[PDB]
Nucleic acid binder design. Structure first.
Ligand SMILES: [Mg+2]
Ligand SMILES: [Mg+2]
Ligand SMILES: [Mg+2]
Ligand SMILES: [Mg+2]
Ligand SMILES: [Mg+2]
Ligand SMILES: [Mg+2]
Ligand SMILES: [Mg+2]
Ligand SMILES: [Mg+2]
Ligand SMILES: [Mg+2]
Ligand SMILES: [Mg+2]
Ligand SMILES: [Mg+2]
Ligand SMILES: [Mg+2]
Ligand SMILES: [Mg+2]
Ligand SMILES: [Mg+2]
Ligand SMILES: [Mg+2]
Ligand SMILES: [Mg+2]
Ligand SMILES: [Mg+2]
Ligand SMILES: [Mg+2]
Ligand SMILES: [Mg+2]
Ligand SMILES: [Mg+2]
Ligand SMILES: [Mg+2]
Ligand SMILES: [Mg+2]
Ligand SMILES: [Mg+2]
Ligand SMILES: [Mg+2]
Ligand SMILES: [Mg+2]
Ligand SMILES: [Mg+2]
Ligand SMILES: [Mg+2]
Ligand SMILES: [Mg+2]
Ligand SMILES: [Mg+2]
Ligand SMILES: [Mg+2]
Ligand SMILES: [Mg+2]
Ligand SMILES: [Mg+2]
Ligand SMILES: [Mg+2]
Ligand SMILES: [Mg+2]
Ligand SMILES: [Mg+2]
Ligand SMILES: [Mg+2]
Ligand SMILES: [Mg+2]
Ligand SMILES: [Mg+2]
Ligand SMILES: [Mg+2]
Ligand SMILES: [Mg+2]
Ligand SMILES: [Mg+2]
Ligand SMILES: [Mg+2]
Ligand SMILES: [Mg+2]
Ligand SMILES: [Mg+2]
Ligand SMILES: [Mg+2]
Ligand SMILES: [Mg+2]
Ligand SMILES: [Mg+2]
Ligand SMILES: [Mg+2]
Ligand SMILES: [Mg+2]
Ligand SMILES: [Mg+2]
Ligand SMILES: [Mg+2]
Ligand SMILES: [Mg+2]
Ligand SMILES: [Mg+2]
Ligand SMILES: [Mg+2]
Ligand SMILES: [Mg+2]
Ligand SMILES: [Mg+2]
Ligand SMILES: [Mg+2]
Ligand SMILES: [Mg+2]
Ligand SMILES: [Mg+2]
Ligand SMILES: [Mg+2]
Ligand SMILES: [Mg+2]
Ligand SMILES: [Mg+2]
Ligand SMILES: [Mg+2]
Ligand SMILES: [Mg+2]
Ligand SMILES: [Mg+2]
Ligand SMILES: [Mg+2]
Ligand SMILES: [Mg+2]
Ligand SMILES: [Mg+2]
Ligand SMILES: [Mg+2]
Ligand SMILES: [Mg+2]
Ligand SMILES: [Mg+2]
Ligand SMILES: [Mg+2]
Ligand SMILES: [Mg+2]
Ligand SMILES: [Mg+2]
Ligand SMILES: [Mg+2]
Ligand SMILES: [Mg+2]
Ligand SMILES: [Mg+2]
Ligand SMILES: [Mg+2]
Ligand SMILES: [Mg+2]
Ligand SMILES: [Mg+2]
Ligand SMILES: [Mg+2]
Ligand SMILES: [Mg+2]
Ligand SMILES: [Mg+2]
Ligand SMILES: [Mg+2]
Ligand SMILES: [Mg+2]
Ligand SMILES: [Mg+2]
Ligand SMILES: [Mg+2]
Ligand SMILES: [Mg+2]
Ligand SMILES: [Mg+2]
Ligand SMILES: [Mg+2]
Ligand SMILES: [Mg+2]
Ligand SMILES: [Mg+2]
Ligand SMILES: [Mg+2]
Ligand SMILES: [Mg+2]
Ligand SMILES: [Mg+2]
Ligand SMILES: [Mg+2]
Ligand SMILES: [Mg+2]
Ligand SMILES: [Mg+2]
Ligand SMILES: [Mg+2]
Ligand SMILES: [Mg+2]
Ligand SMILES: [Mg+2]
Ligand SMILES: [Mg+2]
Ligand SMILES: [Mg+2]
Ligand SMILES: [Mg+2]
Ligand SMILES: [Mg+2]
Ligand SMILES: [Mg+2]
Ligand SMILES: [Mg+2]
Ligand SMILES: [Mg+2]
Ligand SMILES: [Mg+2]
Ligand SMILES: [Mg+2]
Ligand SMILES: [Mg+2]
Ligand SMILES: [Mg+2]
Ligand SMILES: [Mg+2]
Ligand SMILES: [Mg+2]
Ligand SMILES: [Mg+2]
Ligand SMILES: [Mg+2]
Ligand SMILES: [Mg+2]
Lengths: 59, 98, 187, 76, 134
RNA sequence: UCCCCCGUGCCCAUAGCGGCGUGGAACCACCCGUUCCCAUUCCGAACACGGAAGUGAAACGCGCCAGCGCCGAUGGUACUGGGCGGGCGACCGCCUGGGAGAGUAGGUCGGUGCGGGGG
RNA sequence: AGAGCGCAAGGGUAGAAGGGGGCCUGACUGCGAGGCCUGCAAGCCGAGCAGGGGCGAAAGCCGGGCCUAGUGAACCGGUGGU
RNA sequence: UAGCUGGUUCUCCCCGAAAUGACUUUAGGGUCAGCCUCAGGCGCUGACUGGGGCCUGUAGAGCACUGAUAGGGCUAGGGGGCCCACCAGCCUACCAAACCCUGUCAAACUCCGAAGGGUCCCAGGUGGAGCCUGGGAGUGAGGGCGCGAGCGAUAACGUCCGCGUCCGAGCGCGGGAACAACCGAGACCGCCAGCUAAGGCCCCCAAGUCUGGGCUAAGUGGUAAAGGAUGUGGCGCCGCGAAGACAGCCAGGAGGUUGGCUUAGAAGCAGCCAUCCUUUAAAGAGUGCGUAAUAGCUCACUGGUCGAGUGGCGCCGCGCCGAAAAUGA
């Protein structure tokens, strides 16, 4: 499937540790940061659980 | 009362099932874990005479013939519901002739 | 009774209910599909139809259907209907509860007392042709301490019972009273 | 108030789930009774402990009226 | 009665089973709020009911106190409550039917139940036997 | 390849309880006897040996019946990972993914593997 | 299977772990792969090898008891033995 | 001697805790483990995620076990009454074992049973991940908040655990009037540049006295309950109506009857029990008052007039009462 472009819009401060490790997994360091990743079931698996923190688009 | 079978199945392999009737006596070499018979020296299915205790000792060797001809030796004796003594003991004693 | 039914599918059952549509499901030995009906109209029907009287359902296909009500799930808090079961009949015998009319007054009700109606209706096997709008029972020989079983009923022709004969239909019980209280609290 | 009591936690239950590779002799399951029956290549001790009998893979079998079983399918 | 000893409080979660339908009598009184109903409550309602229509019909009570309600006696912090000062209560989730009446006019049962409501802590509703059965 | 029977497995009640019917050539059982091997805390009931006659009553084998038992959806709901929104609270409501139990419709008096005897 | 399984409870259990009988003493010695549990120290399970044995026709089973409580580091001293 | 209190002095840079477990004449102290850091070594494994397998007994539900439970049925046992004794028989708007029907409750009940969680395999994952051996530590009073239970009183800024999280150490910044832990957000330094977040855009105070459609007349909003009321607006249902209703006004409103019974009296009107007819267009063996008991008044119902709507009930929105405190609002 075409690449995925995710962006962090809400801060993880005060969210469960797992949701922190998720963003670190995807490679989202600071806020408002861009990050495009070959979409696989494994990559979307984290994007899913952090959806309340990020806005995604297809590329 | 088939506790005897359960106890044997747990051991090695090659169960010598020995069903016996009022005028009959059978015997199979069953390697379980697949439920298949390898040898089957029947009596009232072979042709043998009439004396039972004398007849059984004969059918016993009928297995020995067909057993070694295939390569078998685990004497795992399934003494079924019947107590080891009569035509069973003879069927066995006979089987052990080889 | 008749009622205009409509077919259902992917639509969110909750979304339907917000509009006014009580979802339901018609089915039988050979048939089965999702549907629904207008709630307000359903109420007006069911207030007399219930699970006793038959109900012909008209789909947008004009298809008439001799459905019955098999069950109506309710929402606790504001007792209200969630969804309906429609048993589509053919002609073979089909179990169903039939009404009951306890006509007459026992000596109990006269001499102070009350008739408890254990079964307001009875389950009986019968052909869709035989849909007796009610059975009757001459509750009058009854008194405080007496009781009627299914082992005796105004069974019309062809209508055989499926419930046990020894099941109690109704009985007359003594009244609760004030002079009982002084006696009760003593213990 | 006579009541402030209890006994040690015994940390029992299944010790090796299905698919897990096992060395011969290592333990598969500790249990109160026979909540699990032994079976092929699996022995049982005084406390009803089930232990693998040869290197292999653990797998569980349910046999209804006859209860559940733990097996080690060998390979080497 | 029997059971054994005293019992944990638990929590009155959603009225999942906290709902019902009439199964005896023509009229009923259903709960609308979660609450522990005391024996002293159930009774006071039941009596005030008959007390209203003397020698009247017949009332049913579908809720029953099996829960021991404990209470420490004006002190500090040792042990579990000797409890039972209020003794026993019945769990009531909003929607459950509590009291049935039967064998009386509507205005005769619209009052009896109207009263039994007052003797209760919670807000309640009266009901006709609609037409919903099984 | 097909049919009946014998033995033995596999799943583990849709295989069961019960009611009706059928099978003795073959196989199986009861069945004749208790000298011998063997056996009864008494008894050939059981276990055992030697076995004709009779029988298919019992037992078992096969087949029918849905009264009991057992299996049992679909639809909806309770509950609930995760994400939110309202009230003093005991509490309640929405989005997203998962989704019962009970109950309704229905289903079932079994399916199969290896050897052996027999048309 | 709601009984029994010495004794609290639980799990388990008649396809015996339950009741009875014959012979019996493995309530063995020398060990112990690999584990469970675990801060330490402890506690627990254990196939198999050797010796010499018990019951069984044999396959086999026996290093106490259906299982989980019935217990006490080290120090100091007692008795027996090499 | 002090397991206690106090005090401990220059600078910049990197990382960065704990307030838990076990034992402790231990409880504000210690030893080991947990968590921090440095050095050397291994190098894709790490948190998190996808797929698959196995382990599980909670939420919910259920009554099949263990118990609890309302009504009814059937029915041993016992109790009262007829009747009696040789003991036998029937009745039983008394209590009730077993059993059955309906209807239910349970942390220490489970025929069932999620979501999820645990673990192993494979794959994504180079991260102030992870693993092996060592040097140095501190911590071992936590607190609040969300959720799940116990204790308590379904009290406490209460208490004890569990999963999170923030303060602790972010009393640095923005919002919340002010305010560790609520909302937003992780401050390397400079800028009289820009977009936003929560929250806000009438004045103190940046930014709409913005647009469109409703509701609210209480200062509600500006923080309270059972419960009470012709508040106001809105959907729905039943009924009355131009064949003449609702309201008011003109007239009758009764006869046997003064209902049977209780009672000093009970005349429709303390209470108990209740189900006639007839003059007729209509008047109920009676709605309320009046009585010592009655007569008197009225509705109910019918006639006339009028001339257009009216009455009851269910549901939703906002509001009203319920509502008393001590320095000045
Ligand atoms: Mg950040
Ligand atoms: Mg936050
Ligand atoms: Mg997780
Ligand atoms: Mg304790
Ligand atoms: Mg404790
Ligand atoms: Mg089990
Ligand atoms: Mg052993
Ligand atoms: Mg009662
Ligand atoms: Mg004190
Ligand atoms: Mg005491
Ligand atoms: Mg052929
Ligand atoms: Mg018959
Ligand atoms: Mg014979
Ligand atoms: Mg003799
Ligand atoms: Mg001889
Ligand atoms: Mg001899
Ligand atoms: Mg013989
Ligand atoms: Mg016959
Ligand atoms: Mg039979
Ligand atoms: Mg037929
Ligand atoms: Mg059936
Ligand atoms: Mg049936
Ligand atoms: Mg479903
Ligand atoms: Mg509140
Ligand atoms: Mg609340
Ligand atoms: Mg789903
Ligand atoms: Mg289901
Ligand atoms: Mg069957
Ligand atoms: Mg088959
Ligand atoms: Mg049982
Ligand atoms: Mg038991
Ligand atoms: Mg016992
Ligand atoms: Mg015992
Ligand atoms: Mg037990
Ligand atoms: Mg078994
Ligand atoms: Mg014994
Ligand atoms: Mg024994
Ligand atoms: Mg003995
Ligand atoms: Mg070794
Ligand atoms: Mg070891
Ligand atoms: Mg250790
Ligand atoms: Mg140490
Ligand atoms: Mg060994
Ligand atoms: Mg040896
Ligand atoms: Mg051994
Ligand atoms: Mg013992
Ligand atoms: Mg043993
Ligand atoms: Mg023993
Ligand atoms: Mg144990
Ligand atoms: Mg010393
Ligand atoms: Mg550094
Ligand atoms: Mg840092
Ligand atoms: Mg200890
Ligand atoms: Mg100290
Ligand atoms: Mg340390
Ligand atoms: Mg990697
Ligand atoms: Mg289960
Ligand atoms: Mg529950
Ligand atoms: Mg059942
Ligand atoms: Mg019980
Ligand atoms: Mg018991
Ligand atoms: Mg009777
Ligand atoms: Mg009696
Ligand atoms: Mg008598
Ligand atoms: Mg007598
Ligand atoms: Mg009698
Ligand atoms: Mg429970
Ligand atoms: Mg338990
Ligand atoms: Mg679920
Ligand atoms: Mg997982
Ligand atoms: Mg998994
Ligand atoms: Mg790089
Ligand atoms: Mg770091
Ligand atoms: Mg680090
Ligand atoms: Mg590693
Ligand atoms: Mg270190
Ligand atoms: Mg230290
Ligand atoms: Mg300490
Ligand atoms: Mg503290
Ligand atoms: Mg905390
Ligand atoms: Mg809260
Ligand atoms: Mg919340
Ligand atoms: Mg406490
Ligand atoms: Mg609570
Ligand atoms: Mg608090
Ligand atoms: Mg501090
Ligand atoms: Mg922090
Ligand atoms: Mg400050
Ligand atoms: Mg602040
Ligand atoms: Mg200000
Ligand atoms: Mg603050
Ligand atoms: Mg501040
Ligand atoms: Mg702050
Ligand atoms: Mg927010
Ligand atoms: Mg502002
Ligand atoms: Mg208020
Ligand atoms: Mg309030
Ligand atoms: Mg208010
Ligand atoms: Mg209010
Ligand atoms: Mg008022
Ligand atoms: Mg009218
Ligand atoms: Mg006209
Ligand atoms: Mg008016
Ligand atoms: Mg006028
Ligand atoms: Mg007048
Ligand atoms: Mg007048
Ligand atoms: Mg008149
Ligand atoms: Mg009049
Ligand atoms: Mg007048
Ligand atoms: Mg009159
Ligand atoms: Mg008068
Ligand atoms: Mg006057
Ligand atoms: Mg309303
Ligand atoms: Mg409303
Ligand atoms: Mg309000
Ligand atoms: Mg005032
Ligand atoms: Mg003042």
């Amino acid at each position: 499937m075409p690449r995925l472009k995710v962006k962090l819009v809400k801060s993880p401060i005060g969210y469960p540790k797992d949701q922190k490790a998720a963003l670190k997994a995807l490679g989202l360091r600071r806020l408002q940061q861009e990050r495009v990743l070959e979409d696989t079931p494994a990559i979307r698996g984290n994007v899913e659980k952090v959806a309340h923190l990020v806005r995604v688009e297809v590329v | 009362k088939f506790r005897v079978r359960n106890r044997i199945k747990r051991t090695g392999r090659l169960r010598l099932s020995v069903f016996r009737s009022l005028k009959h006596i059978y015997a199979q070499i069953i390697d379980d874990e697949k439920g298949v018979t390898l040898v089957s020296a029947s009596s009232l299915a072979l042709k043998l005479k009439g004396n039972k205790t004398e007849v059984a000792r004969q059918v016993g060797r009928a297995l020995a013939e067909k057993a070694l001809a295939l390569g078998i030796k685990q004497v795992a004796f399934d003494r079924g519901p019947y107590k080891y003594h009569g035509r069973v003991k003879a069927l066995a004693e006979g089987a052990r002739e080889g | 009774y008749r009622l205009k039914a409509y077919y259902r599918e992917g639509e969110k059952p909750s979304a339907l209910r917000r509009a006014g549509k009580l979802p339901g499901v018609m089915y039988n030995r050979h048939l089965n599909r999702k549907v629904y009906v207008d709630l307000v109209e359903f109420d007006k029907v069911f207030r007399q139809a219930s699970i006793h009287h038959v109900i012909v359902l008209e789909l947008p296909d004009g298809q008439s259907l001799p459905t019955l009500v098999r069950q109506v799930n309710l929402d606790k808090r504001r007792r209200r209907p969630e969804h309906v079961d429609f048993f589509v009949l053919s002609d073979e015998p089909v179990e169903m509860y039939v009404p009951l009319r306890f006509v007459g007054t026992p000596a109990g009700v006269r001499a102070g007392g009350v008739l408890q109606e254990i079964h307001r209706d009875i389950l009986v096997k019968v052909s869709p042709r035989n849909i007796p709008e009610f059975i009757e029972v001459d509750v009058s020989g009854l008194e405080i301490g007496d009781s009627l079983h299914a082992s005796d009923l105004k069974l019309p022709p062809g209508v055989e019972l499926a419930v046990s004969p020894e099941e109690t239909i109704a009985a007359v019980v003594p009244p609760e009273d004030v002079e009982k209280l002084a006696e009760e609290a003593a213990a | 108030t006579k009541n402030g009591r209890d006994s040690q936690a015994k940390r029992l239950g299944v010790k090796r789930y299905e698919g897990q590779v096992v060395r011969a002799g290592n333990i598969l399951v500790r249990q109160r009774g026979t909540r699990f029956k032994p079976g092929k290549n699996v022995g049982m001790g005084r406390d009803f402990t089930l232990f693998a009998l040869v290197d292999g893979v653990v797998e569980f079998q349910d046999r209804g009226r006859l209860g559940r079983y733990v097996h080690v399918r060998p390979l080497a | 009665r029997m059971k054994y000893r005293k019992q944990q409080r638990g929590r009155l979660k959603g009225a999942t089973k906290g709902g019902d339908y009439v199964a005896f009598g023509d009229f009923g009184l259903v709960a609308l709020e979660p609450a522990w109903i005391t024996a002293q409550q159930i009774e006071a309602a039941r009596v005030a009911m008959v007390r209203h229509f003397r020698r009247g019909g017949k009332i049913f009570i579908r809720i029953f106190p099996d829960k021991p309600y404990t209470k420490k006696p004006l002190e500090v912090r040792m042990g579990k409550g000797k409890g039972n000062v209020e003794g026993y209560v019945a769990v009531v989730k909003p929607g459950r039917v509590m009291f049935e009446v039967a064998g009386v006019t509507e205005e005769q049962a619209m009052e009896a139940l109207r009263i039994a409501g007052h003797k209760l802590p919670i807000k309640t509703k009266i009901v006709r036997r609609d037409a919903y059965d099984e």
